[PDB]
């Protein structure tokens, strides 16, 4: 009925469990694993496996799991645990074998872990597992979770059409949860929501109790840009179960995106009261304040945002709103204290303020801020770029030239600094060789960046040759159509003596934006007339 203890086995187990009670679990695990390997009885092996899982030693975990599985093959739990551990060990077709053993004894199975680790698995081993799963399907066409696994394999390969069609063929597969969620993901991959919405609604009908299908339907509706249906679905989800916090956050985000400020504000206020994910809650409260035009709430909500990823964008938005709404003194002092709180954030916020002041077209405060930043942290390259921009605004090329030269020396492989320096120098300086070689070095270091080809075309027009300038501007357009590239094209047309072509070229961009600032600046620079 019950086996017997050899003396050493009893000694080992006793000392192991005593140590475990004293929490010296290392001795417990070592002794238990050794005794499990020796006796191979189900009890010792299972206890050792549980201890290892609690601690989490992958090698010992797998050894004990497989030994337990061998000791009591009849038990389903041992087989599934061994399969899971073996999958965690990178050996996957053997885990599939153990999962077949599980399926022999009908019960719960976890094939999503297999599929995910296959996604982690290398492409050659991925193909090996693909053929193994095909063999399983030939052996076991009934199962749907292997279908999910093969569909995930195909998605990792990039052709989910076959597996998606096979899954849709089976009504039972269409009626389950994981296949439906995978179908939604695949549809998003191929981007056809017209079929995701109906099938997702059919799944909602099949089992509305579950949350994953409804959440996927809400995400697909958000993709569809429809707002009323998404809001109704979110409200129904909350009424069915308001417990989930992620559901509430997604609800608030969709409410904000749907132009529903009152209900979104209610959700954000209750989230803040819960004080969970409060930074984003205050960020969205400030956003709906902007939508309400109230500057006090908009700035105070962003000020209340705790440090985090959303705080710095929120701080920048607060600075922009404050500068728009006046009250320069209070905004400046609040920003200064917030910066003095942390120097690493101080440099970024000072740069933000200096750039905002430069954009607003004021001189004294912008120069004050930039010079303060340079004095405190002169070695930062962003401060050097800001000083160069301020110099360009001041109409003096010396400071910008020196700052960009030092930046270029600092980074031999940089290209943005080289292109900016070349473009500005050709804008100001009469000589073109310096800017020409700067842009040439920039192109050699990085020719793909659109600004590089933009500056290249500018300098080539400055040189006086047409073919190279036109080809470089065409390349810049190919990388990205930019208004500066078209401006240099119009400049080339001007220098070649045809005014109609440049007239139409700038007319196109005027049609792009009736009151574009850069277009007007370039027109006053080139045409020299009020009426182009």
């Amino acid at each position: 009925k019950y086996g017997s203890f050899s003396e050493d086995s009893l000694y080992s187990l006793l000392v192991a469990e005593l140590a475990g009670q004293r929490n010296r679990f290392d001795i417990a695990l070592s002794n238990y694993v050794v005794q499990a390997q020796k006796t191979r009885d189900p009890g010792v092996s299972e206890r050792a496996f549980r201890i290892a899982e609690y601690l989490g030693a992958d090698q010992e975990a797998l050894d004990t799991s497989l030994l337990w599985a061998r000791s009591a093959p009849d038990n389903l739990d041992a087989q599934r645990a061994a399969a899971i551990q073996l999958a965690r060990a990178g050996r996957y077709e053997e885990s599939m074998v153990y999962m077949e053993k599980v399926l022999n004894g009908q019960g719960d199975t976890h094939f999503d872990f297999l599929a995910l680790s296959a996604a982690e698995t290398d492409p050659d081993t991925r193909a090996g597992l693909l053929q193994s799963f095909d063999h399983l399907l030939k052996k076991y066409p009934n199962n749907g979770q292997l279908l999910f696994g093969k569909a995930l394999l195909l998605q990792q390969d990039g052709r989910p059409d076959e597996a998606l069609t096979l899954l849709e063929d089976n009504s039972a597969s269409r009626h389950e949860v994981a296949p439906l969620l995978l179908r939604s993901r695949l549809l998003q991959s191929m981007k056809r929501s017209d079929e995701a919405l109906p099938l997702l609604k059919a799944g909602i009908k099949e089992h509305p109790d579950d949350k994953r299908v409804r959440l996927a339907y809400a995400r697909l509706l958000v993709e569809q840009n429809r707002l009323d249906d998404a809001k109704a679905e979110f409200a129904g989800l909350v009424q069915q179960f308001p417990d989930d916090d992620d559901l509430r956050f997604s609800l608030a985000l969709v409410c904000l995106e749907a132009q529903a400020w009152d209900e979104a504000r209610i959700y954000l206020e209750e989230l803040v009261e819960r004080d969970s994910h409060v930074d984003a809650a205050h960020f969205n409260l400030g956003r709906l304040a902007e939508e309400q035009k109230d500057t006090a709430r908009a700035l105070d909500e962003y000020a209340q945002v705790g440090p985090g990823n959303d705080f710095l964008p929120a701080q920048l938005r607060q600075t922009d709103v404050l500068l728009k709404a006046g009250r320069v003194d209070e905004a400046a002092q609040r920003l200064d204290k917030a910066r003095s709180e942390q120097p690493d954030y101080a440099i970024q916020l000072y740069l933000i303020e200096a750039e905002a002041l430069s954009n607003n077209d004021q001189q004294e405060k912008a120069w004050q801020a930039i010079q303060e930043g340079l004095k405190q942290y002169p070695e930062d390259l962003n401060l050097l770029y800001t000083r160069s921009m301020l110099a360009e605004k001041r109409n003096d090329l010396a400071q910008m030239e020196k700052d960009l030269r030092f930046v270029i020396a600092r980074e031999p492989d940089n290209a943005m600094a080289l292109n900016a320096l070349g473009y500005t120098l050709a804008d100001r300086t009469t000589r073109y060789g310096e800017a020409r070689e700067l842009i040439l070095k920039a192109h050699k270091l990085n020719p793909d960046d659109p600004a590089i080809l933009d500056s290249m075309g500018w300098i080539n027009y400055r040189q006086g040759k047409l073919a190279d300038a036109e080809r470089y501007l065409r390349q810049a357009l190919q990388r990205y159509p930019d208004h500066e590239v078209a401006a240099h094209l119009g400049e080339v047309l001007w220098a070649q003596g045809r005014q109609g072509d440049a007239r139409a070229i700038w007319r196109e961009y005027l049609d792009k934006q009736p009151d574009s600032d850069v277009l007007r600046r370039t027109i006053k620079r080139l045409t020299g007339a009020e009426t182009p």
């Binding site: 019950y2 017997s4 203890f5 050899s6 003396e7 050493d8 009893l10 000694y11 006793l14 000392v15 005593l18 140590a19 004293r22 010296r24």
Partner: protein, 364 residues
């Protein structure tokens, strides 16, 4: 990083191996480990000991008087069953059972040839199980009575009136309900005398013990204020203090406590609380001198070890462990040569005389 007893456990394992190898009767590991546990608990100290499933159930039924059965206290002598008493609130009285009735078969099992323990075991059974009794009355033809087994509570406390104005209260054993039992007994004794109680005598002779809470409750029922008992142990959870509430049904009536050599921890708690508080005058022989509070710690398979966790102290601070309480008036068992219990019992007569004298010299 306290070291573990490696060599000690090695000796233990060697002992187990040699015992399983050399013993005559094959013994499975289950029995040996059970015996080792019982050994630890028994040899640690006298009272502490392991509890088996059936023994744990026995203890639970002892502490809580509610037990499965019919509720008839009997004694088997000369091969015939004597009905000592059919307890109240039971079908026994409603079944016409009378003292001395000759029960011949319990559930059809003859009552002859059985020992007292065997007869008690056979009579007892699972709660709610119907029981058929074949009874021979005056040697006539037997008759069958069907009854339903139920929960019967045993009245721990018995109260009576000795002489007009003097009442007697005996505590057979301390049980969970003993507190309410004492409260109601005091209330009914007080109303019986129409308000005034001249003198009260309490008896704790041969009281093996019981649940501590009941003893503290009784002491509170006989004390207006003060702290009853505090228990100290090396574990914080056991460290405790129990004190009396302002409520006192006694109404400041003279009290005399009898402590015999058989009065144990639970009763000694009440004795010490009533003595060190100068509320009652102990008399009799020295007590059992047992000081300890034991906790039963539930375990799997409903066999829970009971272990002495802490030592209690009298309110003054002296510990009665191993020395006990010396009664103020050490009156021993004796016979005096020149339905009243006092005449037969010498100690009760002495206590009644002392209370009479105290009340008279009070002139109230």
């Amino acid at each position: 990083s306290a070291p573990l007893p490696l060599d000690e456990l090695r000796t233990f394992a060697e002992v187990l191996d040699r015992v399983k190898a050399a013993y005559v009767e094959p013994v499975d590991d289950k029995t040996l480990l059970e015996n080792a546990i019982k050994g630890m608990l028994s040899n640690l100290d006298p009272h502490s000991a392991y509890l088996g499933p059936e023994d744990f159930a026995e203890l639970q039924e002892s502490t809580s008087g509610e037990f499965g059965g019919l509720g008839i206290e009997v004694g088997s002598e000369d091969g015939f069953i004597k009905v000592v008493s059919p307890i109240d609130d039971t079908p026994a009285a409603r079944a016409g059972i009378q003292p001395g009735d000759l029960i011949v078969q319990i559930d059809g099992k003859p009552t002859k040839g059985q020992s007292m323990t065997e007869a008690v075991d056979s009579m007892r059974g699972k709660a709610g199980s119907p029981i058929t009794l074949t009874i021979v009355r005056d040697g006539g033809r037997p008759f069958d009575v069907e009854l339903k087994r139920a929960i019967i509570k045993v009245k721990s406390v018995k109260s009576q009136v000795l002489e007009p104005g003097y009442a007697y209260l005996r505590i057979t054993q301390f049980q969970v309900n003993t507190g309410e039992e004492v409260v109601k007994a005091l209330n009914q004794l007080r109303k019986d005398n129409k308000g005034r109680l001249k003198g009260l005598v309490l008896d704790l002779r041969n009281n093996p013990g019981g649940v501590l809470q009941s003893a503290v409750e009784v002491a509170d029922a006989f004390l207006t204020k003060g702290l009853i008992v505090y228990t100290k142990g090396r574990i914080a959870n056991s460290e405790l203090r129990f004190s009396a509430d302002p409520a006192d049904p006694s109404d400041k009536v003279p009290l005399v406590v009898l402590i015999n050599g058989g009065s144990a921890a639970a009763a000694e708690i009440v004795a010490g609380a009533l003595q060190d508080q100068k509320r009652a005058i102990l008399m009799g022989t020295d007590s059992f001198g047992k000081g300890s509070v034991q906790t039963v710690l539930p375990l799997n398979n409903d066999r829970a070890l009971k272990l002495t966790t802490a030592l209690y102290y009298t309110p003054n601070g002296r510990s009665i462990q191993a020395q006990g309480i010396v009664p103020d008036i050490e009156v021993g068992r004796a016979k005096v040569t020149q339905e009243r219990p006092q005449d037969s019992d010498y100690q009760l007569s002495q206590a009644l005389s002392l209370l009479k004298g105290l009340s008279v010299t009070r002139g109230n």
